[PDB]
Subunit: 503 residues, 4 copies
Amino acid sequence: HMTTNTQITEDRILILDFGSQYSQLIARRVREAGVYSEMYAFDMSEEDIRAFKPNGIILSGGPESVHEEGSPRAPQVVFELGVPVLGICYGLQTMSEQLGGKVEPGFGYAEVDIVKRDQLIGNLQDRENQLHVWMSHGDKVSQIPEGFTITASTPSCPVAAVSDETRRFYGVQFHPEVTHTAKGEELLSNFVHKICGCGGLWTPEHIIDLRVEQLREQIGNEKVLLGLSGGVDSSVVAALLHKAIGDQLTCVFVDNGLLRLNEGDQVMQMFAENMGIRVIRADAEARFLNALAGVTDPEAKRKIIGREFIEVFAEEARKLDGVKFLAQGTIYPDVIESAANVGGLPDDLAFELVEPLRDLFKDEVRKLGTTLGLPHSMIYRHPFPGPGLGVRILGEVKKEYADILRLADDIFMQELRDSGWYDKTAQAFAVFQPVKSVGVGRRYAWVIALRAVETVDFMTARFAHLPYELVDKISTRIMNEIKDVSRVVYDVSSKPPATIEWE
Amino acid sequence: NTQITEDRILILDFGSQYSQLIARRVREAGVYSEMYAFDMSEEDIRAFKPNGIILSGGPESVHEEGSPRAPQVVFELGVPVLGICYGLQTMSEQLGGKVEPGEFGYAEVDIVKRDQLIGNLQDRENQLHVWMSHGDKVSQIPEGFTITASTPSCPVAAVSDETRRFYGVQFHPEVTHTAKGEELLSNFVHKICGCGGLWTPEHIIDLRVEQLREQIGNEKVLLGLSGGVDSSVVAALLHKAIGDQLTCVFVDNGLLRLNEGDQVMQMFAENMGIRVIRADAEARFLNALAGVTDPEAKRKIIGREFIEVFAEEARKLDGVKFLAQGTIYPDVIESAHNVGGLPDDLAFELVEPLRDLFKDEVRKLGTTLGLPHSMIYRHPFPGPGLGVRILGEVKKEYADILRLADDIFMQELRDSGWYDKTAQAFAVFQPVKSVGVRRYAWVIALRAVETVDFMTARFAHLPYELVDKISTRIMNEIKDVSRVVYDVSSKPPATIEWE
Amino acid sequence: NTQITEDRILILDFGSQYSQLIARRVREAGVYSEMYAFDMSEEDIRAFKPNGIILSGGPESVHEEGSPRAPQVVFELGVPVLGICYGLQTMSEQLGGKVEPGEFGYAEVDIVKRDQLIGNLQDRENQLHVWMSHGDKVSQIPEGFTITASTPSCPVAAVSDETRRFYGVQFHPEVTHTAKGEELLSNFVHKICGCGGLWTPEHIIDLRVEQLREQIGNEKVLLGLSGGVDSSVVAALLHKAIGDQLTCVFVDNGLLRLNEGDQVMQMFAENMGIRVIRADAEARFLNALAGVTDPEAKRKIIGREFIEVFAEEARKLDGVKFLAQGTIYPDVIESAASKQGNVGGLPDDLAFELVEPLRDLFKDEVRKLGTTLGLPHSMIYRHPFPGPGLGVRILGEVKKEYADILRLADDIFMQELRDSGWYDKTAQAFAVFQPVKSVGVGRRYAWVIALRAVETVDFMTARFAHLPYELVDKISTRIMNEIKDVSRVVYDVSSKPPATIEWE
Amino acid sequence: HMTTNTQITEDRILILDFGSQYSQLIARRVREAGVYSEMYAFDMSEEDIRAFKPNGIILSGGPESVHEEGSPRAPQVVFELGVPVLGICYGLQTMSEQLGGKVEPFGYAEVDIVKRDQLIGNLQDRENQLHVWMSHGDKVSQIPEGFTITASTPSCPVAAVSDETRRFYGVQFHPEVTHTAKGEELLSNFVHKICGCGGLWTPEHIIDLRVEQLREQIGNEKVLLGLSGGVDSSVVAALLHKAIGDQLTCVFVDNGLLRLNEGDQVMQMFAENMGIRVIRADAEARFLNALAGVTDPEAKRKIIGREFIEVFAEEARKLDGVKFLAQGTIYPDVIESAHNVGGLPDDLAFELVEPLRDLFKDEVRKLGTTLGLPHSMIYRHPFPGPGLGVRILGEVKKEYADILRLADDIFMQELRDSGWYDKTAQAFAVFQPVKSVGVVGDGRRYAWVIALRAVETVDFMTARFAHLPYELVDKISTRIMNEIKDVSRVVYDVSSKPPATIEWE
Ligand SMILES: [Cl-]
Ligand SMILES: [Cl-]
Ligand SMILES: [Cl-]
Ligand SMILES: [Cl-]
Ligand SMILES: [Cl-]
Ligand SMILES: [Cl-]
Ligand SMILES: [Cl-]
Ligand SMILES: [Cl-]
Ligand SMILES: [Cl-]
Ligand SMILES: [Cl-]
Ligand SMILES: [Cl-]
Ligand SMILES: [Cl-]
Ligand SMILES: [Mg+2]
Ligand SMILES: [Mg+2]
């Protein structure tokens, strides 16, 4: 039969991960440059490496040191396939060791001097014949392998960049995948395009074509069920499936009582009314509040909420007839992290999995949704935890507390959006603390906490630099408009040592 | 492809500064839209075939003699009409109502009847947090109308006649300050007016590529390439539509940022495979600017020499029928002479692939085509470049210093994530000196602003330690700089650029 | 030394929130002053023998009947009189003028005649940058008056009758918002009223030491010593005046900051050589507070136990005639509003006579006195500390476990504020213990500390402090990293109004 | 003859300076504790040390290392006088070296208290600990015999020591800095408990001492004082007025480089309010003429200093029979770290009166407060000798000074109004002779660009640009642009010291 044209993944880069926290950034930067990419652990089998058919290979950094026994090595086939190879920091060091060089034992900015312009450096520079890079100060290449030439250096790091342009092996002692390296994108672009010969077909407009066709091929005339939350990933999945298979899609939305003000109404408005998708709404507030009654331990709260949600979803799924497929919003980071019953549903339900985002990074999901016409407010919304307000009401969850928190959180959101600071944070939300303070008669009422952070990875996060007068306007509004709130505090704890959510 | 503009909304402009926001929010909801002045002829309104009409706000009063009125055909086509503030006031007056003469501010309106416009929407229960227009108010609603929302000060905050499908609000749903404003307008264009959702970046690309191939055929097109968002998206669209028929001319006027010319060539010629001719004209611009201190004279000189350099490059090409420009829909709305301002011997026909798009639609288009974030979300760069960021006489010595200090500024803003948290940022060279440790050297100024429209702007809320990091880097890495200052002047009464 | 109060200015209060600022500005200009309600009896005013009278502003309108007026004796003593806002309006009415009916704002007034009040003063040339009270204006100036300053919007901004020496301004010279306000009031008390400048810290010390020796003689005096500014300055003054006749009792109620008791003993007993009896009462207060969650009940318990501990210590002393207290002039001062409404609160067996060496002094004068006597900056500029101490900074039940944690976190906060220079850039700063927990990182599940810091001049309105971002981050990181039982730090971002400064 | 009673300086501490930038802070904390102190270089002669009669000696820190060649040593008599000695960092290290110990070659630390001597006493931050500002580097590897280690860290086993028989004390951290939480209390235990000193060095007693000393020096003779209105000359004026009354004459010179109405304000306070004889010399035209065409900042400073002395000398020559010139010299000016009177022409031969020359800056302020001088006078930021002459970049012109005076005044008004004046150590406007565009409604402005400068600092050796609130700075720039037609734009100096200076020229 006719099958989906997959031309836009023919050009591809393989990233072998040696342990660096930046390894996924390499893969993401290749995709931003218009080239398909996948990442695997360094000990990827030779069979899989050949079967992948890479146009080029990038060896990431890692927290290891080659001169220690049992240190990671690249598979030898990497240097024998006849395709270019780029080694980043440790990747450069293990490339040197395995090709006749030597590595001698030993993070910050450095200005490397361009001593030879190969095809990786090309015409690039910051200051003249220099590159402002993010350097890993540690191990260094003591002797470059046969056929290599030093292309860049610093006084303290004489081997900052090298290349054997006959075998097309390249290496840098700095990280081009991070923003701290000013020409990092441009360097990686030179590697995948000029050096590896890859085109630029991996773009949102082409990915939509590919994925709609692949979905049609997988699903055919069959029905697909989607758990719809209104988060970015499930929203784009719903839009993709609606475009692909139309009314063969059915969505189930569960209101667990732990959502923000009018969130359920908003999900129905956008997906059922605006977009014309079939959406079943399960209103389960009382069930969740009952399951949570008297539960103060946060881990127990998270367990209960996850369990009741699965039960409610399974109940709704059982009312449907002849649904072969369960769609989920799995993204490529989920799949990378797993290799480092379907849907977790009870066994009476037997779905096959549909995962249209499973090969996409988070920014690609957003670009896809924008291309499909999904509005800014939906695509750029901050993440919302699975347990919802269940982990933003400290200790016991009560309906009275959730209702107050919804009002206070909505004021916070309104002011962030009106002022333009919503998109200038990565996460923001109110927290209900079940303690009271005095305010002016003289009344005595709950203390609300505001949480807002700046981050790119959510692995480190700083409390947000919100303007003084914005914060003051928000706290004044919360206290003036909610009789049950005496006082507002702001979380001034960064990650680490604090977490982003309080529970 | 042309099916994607068949559903369409007409916005009649009564003078509000928010009128274009109405048209933009319709497009964001997935429906094509156009905006015209209120006095649109009945012939043109009928020809537009609107699925619905929105009457904007405005700074006029219905009771004043000669005040604007909607042409009565608006209420006779049998399509829904939404009046916003003045649009509702003139709607009431022209349908047998009364308006009582009377500031902007927030208001909590009470929902009293849930019609098709309000629907199920609310903020607090049965309320809406809105950006209210005080002053003139409807005192008697026309026959067939029902009050749908109110405030104590404003008993007629919203109304509808759902038989004739006439809707009205006394607040502004088109601004962010009305919490459910997007949703109210969505109910109007989709639920009330029956419009679908085909006006999306993926479909707009297909339509515009088709239209470009129809206009251009196999003929050649010339494009002035700057690197700004508009010219970048035009270049990508044209490259897709007509391939090798496109020729770009990029002019390095000596007033660009560090390595800017190399980066333009790297991206458009090398990465994207577009034919780009680079005119290196630094000496020409510096020679023309030498000894010229008046900023208006500098701007005139730079604009004149740019056109001359562009004309000289264009004359070298053979058989080019078309000149492409990055005109956007706000440019056409504002407009309502040789092509390109070029000499008479150059007679091009105009190609304008973005002329029906707003700024954010242009960016969504570029993103859909795979253009990188750094290109699409770049801050604007003025025509005269560094020529208006070097106070008084422009000398190569000053431009070279400024390029280094500006580059440090940009590096720190991008690295810290604050580049995208400002609307505009750049360094300025002041030809004055101060002492440092002994050093006597130039004083650099940093400019950064927050704004959504560039009409009013506040100086940016950059974190103290980021600014300290930037000034310390500049002073430590550039021997010729003694000190860094930060522009703490908002617009108005300061302009964004210094010259 | 009593000469230093012979020159004196009387301020009649018509209800303005700035009325006390007038009296304070007079004292800063070196002239003794007192403040009373507008309805001060004529016999009292004559007995006061003022060298000049200032009629303050007020929240009333002269056109509405039932509104306050000044006693005519004010305009009949032959001493200069200055009317501020409402004081100018009622002066105009009662002297043959008219006031028409008409909020606060800045204004540049034009000087049209340079009398003794305006003098050679100006901001921009022949102008004054002032803080105006709009609303009611003077339409007809009284006879004998010349208009001395004006605005387009307010043609009568300042007046004077230099033969009768009656002066009036439509703006408030007593507030910082008026750029030349100090200098105008200086021209009034010195040039116009002839007052000298003897009311200064060095002379006040000599007068007060002399008066204390006259009141106390060779008798014994007991002082409750808290470590706050007022009690510290009382202790220093009494030590100077009566030496070994002074006995201090300091009570550690278990609700003080880290090492606070040791610091009181170090400074007052060790350094200054004063007799200080230390009552270590932590267990007693914690036992009385255990299981008590209501904040009003906590305050009542703490106040009751403190008096009981103090009384038990007072009973151990032999033949003590006087109890000294840190009462200051704001505690006693007569307002237009305050007029509209056993010693030490001790048991009956304890009958002391009251000594109040600061009762005629404003807060800043108390600090200047302490500085003059050599008390260190850290003692004189300490933020206030509430009577109930940490009792109202631990939400709900007070436990030793919570107080110990709070002391550690508060001490870190104070260290960084004093180190960085921001302690003196706030009016009040402290940590609060919230008995709620949050997750941290192995996983931590521990208490959430709140930090409170405000900026204010009067404590009637206060904004949360503009602490630098990186300082707050340094404080929160230290607290979380150094106290195992704290997971997270929050910052109170609530201003007054509508929030209070203390949480309980 | 009866001479001034100097009992309040009998108790005294000698500080020997080995080169630390914090050495003066030691001397200042002793005075804050109520004890007179003086500081001299480490190589103070035995004769002078004995003549000083110290009740205690503190050996300061230093950048040197005991084992470098030519490294400083304390005069051995320091350990032979029978008075207590405290060594701070290098002072501890050289104390150990010279008493038989061994020395083996900046950040916070929590030192563990292991033995409570009379220096540590009952002090602690966290229980049995001290939060201190440590000097990582040279460590005492072997304490002299008779010493006990009193405090330690894991990385610095010898953080504090004492031999309480000889009363020698030592710390590896700096108690004189604000970074050491209990630093004041530690120094207080040393000067009071350990050295037995009282607390008579207080503002009220200093006033009595200095007034009597001034009367003894001056008698019935006349005194001339150059009066600028700065804090030091203001306190000198107030002290001399109290001491000698109408024997004092002041001369104030308006050099045309002062702030708005500054001359009027000097006359208003000293001549009118305080009743002091003040001669006013209005010399603006003279200074502007001398500065015409001068762009080099060092030439401007030289010209302004020279012309000021000439103007002052002319006023001084009009006075008959004046024996004394008073100056506002303070102890930092004199102090010993590791020419005609007043710099006047030779025809003027004054004897010097210097009532503040043994006082630190904070003590000068306390004296002024004691005398009743207003807060605004006592806590005023410093103002440079050359005035606005170094705040107008390049050539000084009357047009620029007049504009700058208006801009600076707006800045000061808002700082004082908001309470942020006292929350900075220095603040001023700068006139840059460059222009930029503004929008004034439908009209275009093209006018000068004003810079604002404000810093936070304690020592003026390092200074950070001030953390002024966003909305306050916006209020200031809006006011300046809206009230001064000749200003298009306001910028804020965001350069800290180092690598920038506080003043621009
Ligand atoms: Cl809800
Ligand atoms: Cl962010
Ligand atoms: Cl987290
Ligand atoms: Cl360049
Ligand atoms: Cl912005
Ligand atoms: Cl502008
Ligand atoms: Cl304690
Ligand atoms: Cl404050
Ligand atoms: Cl309060
Ligand atoms: Cl002046
Ligand atoms: Cl400061
Ligand atoms: Cl400096
Ligand atoms: Mg509900
Ligand atoms: Mg204890």
